[PDB]
Amino acid sequence: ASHFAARPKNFGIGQDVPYARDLSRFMRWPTFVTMQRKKRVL
RNA sequence: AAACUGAACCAACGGGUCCGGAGUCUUGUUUCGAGACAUCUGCCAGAUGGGGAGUUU
């Protein structure tokens, strides 16, 4: 009687609370960080 | 897929404490629209201008 059972969250657009995602790209960085990147882009 | 008020968190689990579950990558913007334009910025130039100033009559 082993009741260990997988119960996957199955994240979908409307379904379950997702796991935390890495927001690094869309994050708001401090003023000097976005600035020392953009200066490279130029 | 006309609609007519339910619930969802703090991982279950799988693989060899890590990696999955939850694709990886970055010549780099937070994303979208416009864009070398103008309602952008500064100076120079004209027109208008009793809205306002001075004075005369």
Q: Report the Cα A10 to chain-centroid distance in Å.
A: 16
**What is the C-alpha separation between A9 and A33, in angstroms, rounded?**
36
CA distances in angstroms from A35 to A21, A27, A28, A39, listed in the order given: 24, 14, 12, 6
Question: Smallest CA–C1' separation from A36: which nucleotide?
Answer: B28
Resolution (angstroms) stands at 2.9
Strand B proximal residues, A:1-40, Cβ < 7 Å:
4-11, 15-17, 19, 25-26, 28-29, 34, 37-38, 40
Strand B, nucleotides < 7 Å from a protein CB: these are 8-14, 21-22, 26, 28-31
Find the radius of gyration of the CA atoms of chain A. 20
